[PDB]
Design a protein around this ligand. Structure first.
Ligand code: MG
Ligand code: MG
Ligand code: MG
Ligand code: MG
Ligand code: MG
Ligand code: MG
Ligand code: MG
Ligand code: MG
Ligand code: MG
Ligand code: MG
Ligand code: MG
Ligand code: MG
Ligand code: MG
Ligand code: MG
Lengths: 290, 191, 136, 171, 197
RNA sequence: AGAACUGGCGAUGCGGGAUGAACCGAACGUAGAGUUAAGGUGCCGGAAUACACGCUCAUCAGACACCACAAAAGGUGUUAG
RNA sequence: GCAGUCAAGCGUUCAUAGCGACAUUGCUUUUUGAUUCUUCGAUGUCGGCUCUUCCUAUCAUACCGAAGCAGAAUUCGGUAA
RNA sequence: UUUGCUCCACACAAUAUAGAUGGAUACGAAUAAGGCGUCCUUGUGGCGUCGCUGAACCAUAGCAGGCUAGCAACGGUGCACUUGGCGGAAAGGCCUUGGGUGCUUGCUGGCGAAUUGCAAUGUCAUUUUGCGUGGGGAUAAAUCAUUUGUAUACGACUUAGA
């Protein structure tokens, strides 16, 4: 028989499964739409979340009753040292989706980025991109023809960049490497920009400016195995419940004779990848600035 | 009943050239040119004497021979639209709030802008199809004129303008406001 | 200039139209349409080829491009006389449709020695043709 | 099936009170002679007081079409039984023989009125010897002067599962 | 008769083509089908869209990931129609299915090969003139296939290259026809004509 | 729920009705060959994508007795009277 | 329990805006009966609490058609879970 | 870690086969319309022709295809090279220049074949792997253990350590 009183469902069925993310670096599943009239620019940046603080600002909302009045606001600070461009990759469009056609790297890779290709850096011969550096140092032969392949094909161009983890107070030493899409100019202009920016750094004020709405993509804080009461927000059972009260009382009807995928159960809470949109930049601060 | 042969006649005036390969009809006259795809209707065309064109259907049923007269009417509408043209006059009808109709340019796309319909703050914009020209007629109060070669384009633009001014949440027998097409004719009427 | 309408005319069924019988007791002979019975069947007569006067479904015949003059409902002697006067037998035999049919029959009637002979002759003609395809 | 037309002549069995009964004849469309005699007794039982046990059949002869290669127009009067009642119909059929006309009649009745052989009675079939006495349009349209029509969209039947060129429907 | 038969799926009715292809694969013929986005289904587009939404609502109630899988690409729609006609749960059916490949467009293995058609499944030979029909690429796009435009652009490029090939082939054919017409009316040609060639 | 006559199931496999005690066909030693019943012959699946005349287009078509349902009343849909 | 058909009448006037007698055709299985096929070498039996999902014969919300819709309010109906 | 790893050529083994046995032989579009040829004023053009199935076309003779002689042409084809391109949808293929070399059944000759006994698939394909030669090529990581706490029931994760 029907549910005696209606209540909305506990939790969102679109954030399933509530499993641990595959990597600690959340993926950018979509980049901004390209128009080939603006200059060549990165569509994204990498940083490290440092903490939060408060600000006071005068509100400009013509019609609010806090118009032209001070409000205090919570802000979060992302430490963003300038990122290093090492590499470009091109993507052809196929009837099975986007496919990377080739990748062209810079000649010199720093130690902090080539620590990313190792699990045991201290016992290594450090042989990584040595034959690639040998593929360099000719006139242009092995690099210019692959860049020409990217020009001839590859409707989408992405640039491989890596963080300067040594400039942060973190104890990691192993840089984070990511692909960032370029959304200006033709394909030849994009790959020319990438070639010109090999082994070179890009600062965050070249990508972002003040009063800009941006999105934050990150893996949330982990919490391990969690019960249903805090994982899903279900009602606590009454005090005189035998065999525990932090549970869901009925996990399904007799028919169908299976527990449903939509029923709330205990499991991993946190360490899920999330994309949160519409965060206004309040300050683009400079490190070389008291 | 499977009528074994039915046919209709299209008369072609002096300045008119009709070219029909497979079922793509192109008519060229003094006012311009018009084209139409009729590959959905399955008829046959035959030129008789450079002023007459027969269109026929063989072994057809009731719906098929209905479509035959429909295609004859469509083709000669194209012919009379490229000779005389088509002109639809619409009138503004209002009780209290005067309807203000002008022509604006959003990205050079030639819009018709209707303001103050029943005193509301919403601004209604209807786009103008290509080949349709709009003039606000002097010496007649509150009259807009849409002219062109394609009767389908002219009538659909006039219908779009009429449908953009529909009254909501009111008795439309009392609130008779709108822009209504009052005359359909030709640019070179009584030639 | 003048109007251009693609005519697209094809092979009417009428009295005097020559048909090639596709299947049955005749199966490959020419007959003449003597009368139309309805949309799907006609009365035909093939007296020179030995086809009897009969009502037949139009799905059993193929309409040919040949037409001669018959009055409607003409009897077999009249059909024979008009057929021989219009001389549609050799008019049929001159077409490449009839030539293709005869070629198929000849190829099927070949023997093993004859297939060897056409191999040898084809090799000789191929030598001459490929030699000629080096001057242009 | 493929119909044949038979004359069946029968009578009541002779008695001493009345020798020489009156010799009733019927024209029956039937697939064979057994069905022809069965239909004769069925209709004679509808008409006169006799049955098979009290009567006999003196003759049964197949009637051939007199001119089986002349195109005729036939009027056919039919009695038939629907799901709800009994109706009379007049139809007319352009064909070359009476048996072909009644065959396409039975086909047409089964197609258009779902009327089965057990439900149909053939009242009569007769040649309309003069045109303009033809009164149905679906046959009258074939009686115009110098009639000719094409056969658009020829569908050519292949013998192989795979063809090496796109077919043409020209004719 | 061939090792691999390549079928141009354009203008073909889905079920009739699938029945012919299923019988061929069971009998042992390798079949590849190209241009599945140009397949036809008889009936109006709205009818076929409603039929697909009816198929799309059926799923395992307690876990959707084990339910009937609704594949959106035109090649996979054809594959579904064909797997229904093969006994796919047996080893024989699995082998008959792995003798088959289905593609959107004509990919570069098969763009230089000969394409055939199946006349008993062709729309212009099977449907009555006037009957409405659906195009599988349009139906797949309406239900969620994402690659209609990229396949169309690749097909346009392929058609340009194929027209360039065909112009050269036609010119060479006219030269060959001229050569053997001039090399006709000889004694060898007359002997061949007598023998039927 | 309860009677009559017969035939069945129980006590019975086999071919067909997807499936099923009872329906249809046919009743059973172990085999070979031939022909069939009932039912079928697009593909699953052995067997004509046979032939012929019509009818039907459904934004809930229809598709085979037992049998797994549909009615009154309506429709210038179309067909024939 | 829910839905139709016919229309004598109600509705100032006016059968059908909204209703509708005398009749008559249905649907449903959220009522209660009727029955006794399944379980008596046991299928835990009222209600509430908790939680999920489904149906639509829609209370609200979206877009609409009708009125005995001037406006406001309301009533009848459609697509809609 | 006692000469290991990879590639190339053939030498011998093993291993199987969802099933070679002349050739998968490339326009696109329309079908109440097209293909091909030709001409012009280059078009939705004029004229001619074809279809009615691939029953086509190409190939195809020689010890499962031997050994030799000549004639006529300067063609056809195989092989290893070689020049220039084009192809990214899964390109891994298509086209082309030059020379070498073999064959040629286009035509005419000479020699051979038997006994597998009157048939017996009468063995001619391609897939994987191993072991040897001789000729190039290159000289790593990962895990456990320790460590971290952005992670965590355990595994797993994320860090660090010549
Ligand atoms: Mg309940
Ligand atoms: Mg509820
Ligand atoms: Mg307790
Ligand atoms: Mg017992
Ligand atoms: Mg029994
Ligand atoms: Mg079979
Ligand atoms: Mg009716
Ligand atoms: Mg009970
Ligand atoms: Mg009991
Ligand atoms: Mg019990
Ligand atoms: Mg028990
Ligand atoms: Mg239990
Ligand atoms: Mg128990
Ligand atoms: Mg509803």
């Amino acid at each position: 028989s029907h549910r005696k009183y209606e209540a909305p469902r506990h939790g969102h069925l679109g954030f399933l499964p509530r499993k641990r993310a595959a990597s600690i670096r959340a993926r950018v599943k979509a980049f901004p739409k390209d128009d080939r009239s603006k200059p060549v620019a990165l569509t994204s940046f990498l940083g490290y979340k440092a903490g939060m603080t408060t600000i006071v600002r005068d509100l400009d909302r013509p019609g609010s009753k806090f118009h032209k009045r001070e409000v205090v606001e919570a802000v979060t600070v992302v430490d963003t040292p300038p990122v290093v461009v090492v590499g470009v990759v091109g993507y052809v469009e196929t009837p099975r989706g986007l496919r990377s056609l080739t990748t062209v790297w810079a000649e010199h890779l720093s130690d902090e980025v080539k620590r990313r290709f190792y699990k045991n850096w201290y016992k290594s011969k450090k042989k990584a991109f040595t034959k690639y550096s040998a593929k360099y140092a000719q006139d242009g032969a092995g690099i210019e023809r692959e860049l020409a392949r990217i020009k001839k094909y590859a409707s989408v161009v992405r640039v491989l960049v890596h963080t300067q983890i040594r400039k942060t107070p973190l104890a990691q030493k192993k840089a984070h490497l990511a692909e960032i899409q370029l959304n200006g100019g033709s394909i030849s202009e994009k790959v020319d920009w990438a070639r010109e920016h090999f082994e070179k750094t890009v600062a965050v004020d070249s990508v972002f400016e003040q009063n800009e709405m941006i999105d934050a993509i990150a893996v949330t804080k982990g919490h391990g195995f969690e019960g249903v009461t805090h994982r899903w927000g279900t009602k606590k059972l009454p005090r005189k419940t035998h065999r525990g009260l932090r549970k869901v009382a009925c996990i399904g009807a007799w028919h169908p004779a299976h527990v449903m995928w939509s029923v709330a159960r205990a499991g991993q809470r946190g360490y899920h990848s999330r994309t949160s949109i519409n965060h206004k930049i309040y300050r683009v601060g400079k490190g070389d600035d008291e | 009943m499977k009528y074994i042969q039915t046919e209709q006649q299209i008369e072609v005036p002096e300045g008119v050239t009709v070219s029909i390969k497979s079922r793509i009809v192109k008519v060229v006259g003094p006012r311009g040119t018009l084209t139409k795809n009729l590959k959905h209707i399955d008829v046959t065309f035959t030129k008789v004497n450079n002023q007459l064109i027969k269109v026929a259907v063989h072994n057809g049923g009731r719906k098929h021979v209905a479509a035959l007269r429909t295609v004859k009417s469509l083709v000669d509408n194209m012919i009379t639209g490229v000779t005389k043209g088509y002109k639809y006059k619409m009138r503004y009808v209002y009780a209290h709030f005067p309807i203000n109709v002008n022509i604006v340019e959003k990205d050079g796309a030639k819009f018709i802008e209707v303001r103050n319909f029943l005193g509301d703050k919403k601004i209604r914009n209807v786009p103008v199809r290509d080949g349709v020209t709009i003039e606000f007629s002097t010496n007649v109060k509150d009259e807009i004129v849409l002219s062109g070669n394609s009767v389908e384009d002219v009538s659909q633009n006039a219908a779009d303008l009429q449908q953009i001014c529909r009254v909501r949440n009111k008795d439309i027998r009392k609130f008779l406001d709108g822009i209504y097409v009052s005359h359909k004719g030709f640019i070179t009427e009584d030639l | 200039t003048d109007s251009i309408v693609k005519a697209s005319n094809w092979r009417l069924v009428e009295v005097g139209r020559v048909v090639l019988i596709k299947k049955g007791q005749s199966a490959g002979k020419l007959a003449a349409i003597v009368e139309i019975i309805d949309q799907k069947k006609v009365l035909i007569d093939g007296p020179k080829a030995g086809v009897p006067r009969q009502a037949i479904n139009l799905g059993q015949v193929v309409l040919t491009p040949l037409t001669f003059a018959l009055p409607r409902g003409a009897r077999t002697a009249t059909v024979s006389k008009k057929w021989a006067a219009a001389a549609v037998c050799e008019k049929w035999a001159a077409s490449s449709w009839a030539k293709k049919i005869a070629q198929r029959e000849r190829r099927a009637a070949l023997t093993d020695f004859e297939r060897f002979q056409v191999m040898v002759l084809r090799k000789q003609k191929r030598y001459t043709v490929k030699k000629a395809l080096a001057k242009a | 099936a493929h119909f044949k037309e038979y004359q069946v002549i029968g009578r009541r069995l002779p008695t001493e009170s009345v020798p020489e009964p009156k010799l009733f004849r019927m024209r029956i469309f039937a697939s064979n002679e057994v069905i022809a005699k069965s239909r004769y007794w069925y209709f004679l039982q509808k008409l006169h007081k006799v049955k098979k046990a009290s009567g006999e059949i003196v003759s049964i002869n197949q009637i051939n079409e007199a001119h089986p290669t002349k195109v005729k127009n036939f009027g056919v009067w039919v009695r038939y039984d629907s799901r709800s009642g009994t109706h009379n119909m007049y139809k007319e059929i352009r064909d070359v023989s009476r048996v072909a006309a009644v065959e396409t009649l039975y086909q047409d009745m089964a197609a258009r009125h779902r009327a089965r052989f057990r439900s149909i009675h053939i009242l009569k079939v007769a040649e309309i010897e003069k045109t303009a006495d033809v009164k149905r349009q679906y046959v009258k349209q074939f009686l115009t002067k110098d009639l000719k029509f094409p056969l658009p969209h020829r569908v050519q039947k292949s013998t192989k599962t795979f063809s090496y060129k796109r077919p043409s429907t020209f004719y | 008769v061939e090792p691999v038969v390549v079928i141009d799926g354009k203008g073909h009715l889905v079920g009739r083509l699938a029945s012919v292809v299923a019988k061929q694969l069971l009998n042992g013929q390798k079949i590849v089908v190209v241009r599945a986005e140009e397949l036809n289904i008889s009936g109006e587009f709205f009818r076929n869209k409603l039929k697909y939404h009816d198929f799309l609502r059926k799923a395992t109630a307690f876990n959707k990931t084990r339910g009937p899988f609704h594949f959106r690409a035109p090649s996979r729609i054809f594959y579904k129609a064909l797997r229904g006609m093969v006994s796919h749960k047996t080893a024989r059916g699995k082998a008959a299915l792995e003798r088959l490949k289905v593609f959107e467009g004509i990919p570069p293995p098969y763009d230089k090969k000969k394409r055939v058609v199946v006349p008993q499944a062709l729309r212009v030979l099977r449907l009555k003139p006037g009957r409405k029909y659906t195009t599988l690429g349009k139906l797949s796009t309406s239900v969620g296939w994402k690659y209609e435009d990229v396949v169309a652009k690749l097909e346009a490029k392929r058609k340009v290259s194929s027209a360039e090939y065909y112009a050269k082939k036609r010119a060479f054919t006219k030269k060959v026809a001229s050569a053997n017409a001039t090399a006709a009316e000889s004694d060898v040609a007359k002997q061949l004509a007598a023998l039927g060639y």
